[PDB]
């Protein structure tokens, strides 16, 4: 689920 | 009484520097690291390019000819992940007209500015002589984890 910055 | 000194903050953090005068070569695609978030002591991440490399830059347009004496920088803690980012060194580019750009030099070679060792503290760098400019670019050369930038410029307007 989209590794967040 | 105190006389005037050319070393006042020019607008980042303050507000005198409008959102429209700040831009970048690119920005992270999720939209959470825009150039408008590079204001010193901002509490919403900072600026991050679309790709981490030494060709990206943050740009500020002072809109007028301005004496530029020093640059302060921080990294940023990710609001989303509590991860810290910071630029460890950068070059400086300046321009009066926005099209002819001079890379700041110390002697025959580009001045490489040493920057931050963490994501929270301010590192201030002075220029060896005040420079009269209107455009400023910060182009990172090294960084920890990824490029993230908050910024302040110091000087006076003529």
Curated annotation (Swiss-Prot), chain B:
Domain F5/8 type C as annotated: residue spans: 6-156
Annotated disulfide bonds: 6-156
Residues forming coiled coils: none
Biased composition (Polar residues): 27-39
Protein localization: Membrane
Disordered: annotated segments: 27-46
Lineage top rank: taxon: Eukaryota
Family listed: Belongs to the neuropilin family.
Assembly description: Heterodimer with NRP1. Binds PLXNB1.
UniProt free text on domains: The tandem CUB domains mediate binding to semaphorin, while the tandem F5/8 domains are responsible for heparin and VEGF binding.
Role according to the record: High affinity receptor for semaphorins 3C, 3F, VEGF-165 and VEGF-145 isoforms of VEGF, and the PLGF-2 isoform of PGF. (Microbial infection) Acts as a receptor for human cytomegalovirus pentamer-dependent entry in epithelial and endothelial cells.
Protein name listed in UniProt: Neuropilin-2
Organism this protein belongs to: Homo sapiens (Human)
